[PDB]
Symmetry: C2
Subunit: 152 residues, 2 copies
């Protein structure tokens, strides 16, 4: 079953989102898991406020923390993200050839990238995770200026 590790992947992604939230950042987390054995290649969260970073989205920080892997490794992984990916994080999934992307929720944010991934041959799974929806809803409500000056 392709979804064997999906509860583990989204649980780690949410923990990263909650950790980033406690650090004062945007609560978006992710992790990359080897589909073969469920091992975690890397995990991360949005670093826009922790590091003043314009590019360290949750998915980008996750892939950066994985390090430079062999191209064959990416081809049998799933990228977990608590929030539907923007066009840049979509492009990163495509560029590395990660075949599966499991999305916590796309209620608080959605780009054309979710559909573009499927156009480019990737599998996209939206789990509608209530924990992810709640923590991002709170961020948008409490920090609307930070959100709408960013990808909001």
């Amino acid at each position: 079953m392709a979804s064997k590790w999906d509860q583990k992947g989204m649980d780690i992604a949410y923990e990263e989102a909650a950790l980033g939230y406690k650090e004062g950042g945007v609560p978006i987390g992710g992790c990359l898991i080897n589909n073969k054995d469920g091992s975690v290649l890397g995990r991360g969260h949005n670093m826009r406020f922790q590091k003043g970073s314009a590019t360290l989205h949750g998915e980008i920080s996750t892939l950066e923390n994985c390090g430079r892997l062999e191209g064959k490794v990416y081809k049998d992984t799933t990228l977990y993200t608590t929030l539907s990916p923007c066009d840049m994080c979509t492009g990163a999934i495509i560029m590395y050839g990660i075949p599966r992307c499991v999305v916590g929720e796309n209620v608080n944010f959605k780009s054309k990238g979710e559909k573009y991934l499927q156009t480019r041959g990737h599998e996209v799974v939206v789990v509608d995770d209530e924990r992810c929806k709640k923590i991002m809803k709170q961020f948008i409500d409490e920090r609307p200026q930070d959100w709408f000056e960013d990808i909001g």
Copy 2:
């Protein structure tokens, strides 16, 4: 529209050449305000300098710009010595940068170049001989590094 294109590509090439001297992939970029030609940021590929999986030349350029107001990006041109991969294409789209000027797409090209135009962005390929030469040399001298990356 193309008033600053020689300035932008010259800075992008200098970043690529600087990255070459540091031992990295010779891909450079810069972001320029279309209004007055001021440089918002510049950078080069940091895959080998920092062991980075994501700091492509275009990504490093945007990182070096810092967190800007969304209105600022909407009137810029991103200059890159090499045609962008799907990730750097997505960064241009996500920030709404309306213009991308590409040094060359002979040594590398992805579906992103056409996708940028599909999404309403202007793409200009200048066929810069300096950029073609320095990337041709890198591919020849470091084929393992190139083909284990986006090659």
